[PDB]
Amino acid sequence: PMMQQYLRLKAQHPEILLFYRMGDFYELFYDDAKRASQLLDISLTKRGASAGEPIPMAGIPYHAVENYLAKLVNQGESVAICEKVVRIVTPGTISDEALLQERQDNLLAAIWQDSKGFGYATLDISSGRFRLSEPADRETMAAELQRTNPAELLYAEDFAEMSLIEGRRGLRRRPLWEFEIDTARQQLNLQFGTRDLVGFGVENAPRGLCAAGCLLQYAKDTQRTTLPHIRSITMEREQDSIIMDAATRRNLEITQNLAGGAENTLASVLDCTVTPMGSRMLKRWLHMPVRDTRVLLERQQTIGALQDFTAGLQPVLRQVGDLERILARLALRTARPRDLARMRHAFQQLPELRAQLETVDSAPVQALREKMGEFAELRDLLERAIIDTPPVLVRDGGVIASGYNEELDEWRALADGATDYLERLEVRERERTGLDTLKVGFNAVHGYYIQISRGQSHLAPINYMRRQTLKNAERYIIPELKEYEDKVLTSKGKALALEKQLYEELFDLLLPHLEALQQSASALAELDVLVNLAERAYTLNYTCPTFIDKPGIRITEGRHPVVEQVLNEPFIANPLNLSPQRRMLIITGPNMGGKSTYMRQTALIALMAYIGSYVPAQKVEIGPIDRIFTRVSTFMVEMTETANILHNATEYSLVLMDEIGRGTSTYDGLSLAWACAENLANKIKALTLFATHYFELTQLPEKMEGVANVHLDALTIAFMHSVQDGAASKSYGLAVAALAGVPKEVIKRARQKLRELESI
Amino acid sequence: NFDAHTPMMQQYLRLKAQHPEILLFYRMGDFYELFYDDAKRASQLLDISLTKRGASAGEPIPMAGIPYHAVENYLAKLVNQGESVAICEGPVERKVVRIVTPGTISDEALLQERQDNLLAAIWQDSKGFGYATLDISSGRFRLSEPADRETMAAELQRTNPAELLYAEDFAEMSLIEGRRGLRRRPLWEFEIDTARQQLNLQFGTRDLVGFGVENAPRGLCAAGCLLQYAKDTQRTTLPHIRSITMEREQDSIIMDAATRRNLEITQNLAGGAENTLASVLDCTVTPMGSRMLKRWLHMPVRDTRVLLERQQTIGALQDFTAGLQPVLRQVGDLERILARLALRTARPRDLARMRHAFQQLPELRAQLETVDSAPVQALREKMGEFAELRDLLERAIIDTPPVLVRDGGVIASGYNEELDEWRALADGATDYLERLEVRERERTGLDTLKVGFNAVHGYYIQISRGQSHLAPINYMRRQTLKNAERYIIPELKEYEDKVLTSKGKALALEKQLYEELFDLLLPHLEALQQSASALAELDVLVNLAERAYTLNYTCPTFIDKPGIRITEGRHPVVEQVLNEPFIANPLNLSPQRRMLIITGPNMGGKSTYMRQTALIALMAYIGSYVPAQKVEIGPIDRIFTRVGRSTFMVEMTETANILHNATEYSLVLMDEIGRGTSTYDGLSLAWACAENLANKIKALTLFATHYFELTQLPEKMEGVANVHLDALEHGDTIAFMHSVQDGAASKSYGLAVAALAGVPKEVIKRARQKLRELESI
Ligand SMILES: Nc1ncnc2c1ncn2[C@@H]1O[C@H](COP(=O)(O)OP(=O)(O)O)[C@@H](O)[C@H]1O
């Protein structure tokens, strides 16, 4: 009967480690101890046993286990905690603030492999944000697993390309019944309360519904709740956003710099959001730029309309905090008293924001104002039910405010030491009995009593039950008074238990508003983003981009939004004109000329325009952009990226290609660079910026339509960082080499070779 | 308003005034508290709850707490953030006991087992640089006087300190800018005679002539500042630091930062430890052994005699790897344990592990006893025995001691007559007072009656406020705001004294006898540290003896003129990471064959071949056996790797470093110089650089190019020759032979490789057409 209370629910998911209650020290057994002690080096022990075969043990002490949660969970392992197992922690299902990262989303994902493609579904437990997609090929699944980057990945038993999910943290093998399409529909439809999955536009996508269905059960089974925050699933269409492979996200340093850090990136410049849920939304937008023109226009309107009012809106938005992750704990019933105190504090800012946005003459602003609600009755409820600054946990007490419930206020008075009933009883009894010496008292000896002095004692009524005889007086008890003592002795207990019950009641009172509450969390997150982008555009001097109906980019005095911030010396803004009549530019000129910076700034201004933000330029006109491609074992990996561009670019794609042809012979390289420039020019007809050192490619504009020459000017070598019309005058390879420090005689002799080379 | 703060808040504010830029953890028995801006800074970096509690200077106090059992867990995060943390232990007796800093970490839970952790000090004079590093947990103290900015830059990259002490005056800020745990220190700490006085005194010498540093003031200045910093953080003596060691350039193979990264010595190009030379060679069984090898790898010795003894050891121990390794494992990191003995910070289990390490010494001595080799019998001698200290620890501590001495119960019974008697009168102390709480609460039943201990009160009993009425009269109230009222029992306050005094005797005496173990061990520290040094090296050589066995390695041969004569040589990392066999290759370099022009296809093996040459050189120059059938290696002053700002700019800067500092004793590896510029300007540079290293520098050069025009250099020069990598075409697909043959590359395979990478057939069909057209003109 000892061991039979921990394996009760472990039989369902056997990979889960269990911190068992044993001698006020969280322990483990049956090879769970082997890992706990394997990747942590902690004390491997044995427990007393005489059944004929040995018992394995490995432990840790109480209030010295929270640091072992985050370590094992960030490692990729799951942890259950027996007390009853009142907590299961899995890498993709963490709802607690301490384990999560404030400005990074955390995902649970499930992958599937059908006889016509894959099934991929993702969920954030702390948002309720549920997505699904149908990648038909390995290369797209690779790009999806790299972008979503789940902390916990569910895969079927029969999964075929386990190479895609090899060497991954938080991996989970699952039986085929979890993925069954018929039951997945039943599960999902009922989770969203629907007859068909149309309206979410996922009904006709069965590969992804399997992965959705498996995941939904794995979330329910580990979080043991209704999961009310998960009310919808959404397919992400490629046409709906700007496609970018993992290479482009890396070369454009969107949220991560080339060295792994976060410093000196597009997000480090634009992300000045005042809430964690805002920061998270902004980073999401940067990685998924929208192709919807109206969403983008409503986004610019909010930026322009709220620019003057940032100073008043941001300190208020700061006070809202991460309502999103607070509501997730309300949905999972895990919400601590401080979560509810902070939710009230967020609610106390909605009148301010509503009053502030009231006169803003903008339909999308007025739309955010409505969506963010006010929740007048819910604010009042939390003001009345919780104390101003409550404790971290419920159990000790002191959470429920005085005045919310009279029985609590009553119970608390007996626990504090209120003697009002005793004063009332005393007057009643004295007047009732007509004995002036009658007094109500208490001693450890006989408890609560009615004392009558010897001289009146013999006239004590027949209902008085004597307990003590002193020389001066006698002391009695009555049913009424016995009943009061019992209440006084159970006071703290009853009050502590009632607090707990009234605390639960609040969840019941709050949850039927979760939908409206989730829209408010979203409205306020988004508000913080566009108010951030409003302030950024003013401070970092940005203009509103213009949308045109054909492939093309027209940038006037454009800048690199990160380089301009990093540099001490001023940024030299440059123009660009890409149109259906001028599609490809052969960018020539010296090293440190500004070729890379010019190409990347084009991709970032394009990206920013496609997040609804104002851009770093005097003026921008941009057409549809379906994809941003950068090509900016060396030759082999450059050609792999090149083949990706040639196989997937369209007339709506932006192609940035730097020095293609390097890493091979001059002839082979030139041949290859020419072939590629030719293909992207006359066959693909993408918006190409093609940086080269082969001055032979400068003959292409003379040879074909849509191609033209530009160069980075350099002046005895001074880099001017200005893009000019025409092919570059000469080669500064020897001058740059001289500046890098290459010996005089080495440069002098290389100049002699140069004479001989151009003299043949 | 200082005067408006509470008696202990003023004390905190007085202690926080001592070091205004470091977080002060203030002990409050159970917890470590941080206040105000410190509490705000610790709530964010440690992700702990911040609560505005109490009152001080007319306002609530922003507070943040840390449990005592979890202090090490939280300290570990701060030191990983490059942060220093002061530890604090009307009122009386509260001072900063220790100053936890990234470069002075001596505790196991805060250090990486297989990684070295250094505190450094940098100096800049009108005549040059002065550098000094200390590993506090071994006593390893080194100093150098760099000249080049490049020399200083590679030294900082090689040592990569956890903490960098730079003077106020320091000029080239760009050298150390934005690094981890930088510590700007006043110019006086770096004073020459003060540095000489403090260093000589520290090693008990007349002058510093015997360390070879007496003549190096730039280095001595940085070493001096550093020494007083280490002294001031620890707040006690450093007996383990008894020598300073000059690091000259002629002693080791010079490797600039770019070369260390390109050869993936200990860290690969992605930052990971996976697929490194260290990852293949480091199978040592003790942490001290892992760190020594990592050290050896980064600083290959140039001393012929040292290298010969290392090969000798490896050769003589090859057959005893299986016998010595399990015993050597038992020794553990005695080196780090010994430094914790020096700082008197060694916990009971550090002494347990010390006693277990001692138990292995006669066995390791037994095995090595008949090994017929001078460096082996030398390592055997240095290893020591310490039967005297083994018996002492065996008598003083129990089989498995607890983590702390705070609660006590570690000094084994029968070791002290006074302690045995005092503990017997302490076993009946946690008997009667425990049995008291049950019988009293059974006699007067209350749902909330708890017992609490205080330093000034003794033992208190606390009950509910409503329940307080029914509290006994044989109880004496000492009421407080929290909870209800907490009383003391006069009936049993005489027994309270007799128990807390008895426990207070047997615990203060236990700590007295334990403090005495340090006093009994410390006069042997030098001999113990020599023993830890031998045991770590024996681990490194037995490891290298095992690797040479398993990975099939041969002993390299040392020649007198520059040269590398490799027979059936292989890349030690690539051969392990591959499923298919590695095609072994021959290299031949000499004064009459200084430079090779490596021609051949892409993905052919040009890059791997060049990198295997440097690795075989390094491996030979650490004393190891090499991945080859035979190797003859001449002296190597420096290894330069230009293999794999702008792409062109960094390549040109690396080239500039090679041309300016490479000599006839240098091994220079260069992969396609001239890329990132025009075909003519590129060719002009590649030709010029090759012509300079062949004719003027005369370095041992491996020069891989796609400029087939350079295959003409052997026709026009001495000591220059052609080599190529072969491949075969199957009409369409190409199979790479990975074999180094003499002569130039027959053809260029760019179009074939680009088609292998998936470039559209039509695009290759057009690339061929342009090519046909180009080959004709
Ligand atoms: N327009 C500009 N204004 C100011 N500084 C610039 C500009 N463009 C580039 N720079 C600076 O000079 C460097 C030039 O390098 P880069 O653009 O990478 O040239 P390339 O690819 O031709 O070698 C940049 O990293 C940046 O520091």
Ligand SMILES: Nc1ncnc2c1ncn2[C@@H]1O[C@H](COP(=O)(O)OP(=O)(O)O)[C@@H](O)[C@H]1O
């Ligand atoms: N001798 C060898 N035996 C087996 N594989 C080899 C050998 N030399 C190189 N390789 C493999 O060939 C591939 C390409 O080698 P590499 O040196 O990078 O080519 P390149 O000639 O372009 O510089 C790598 O995967 C490497 O592991």
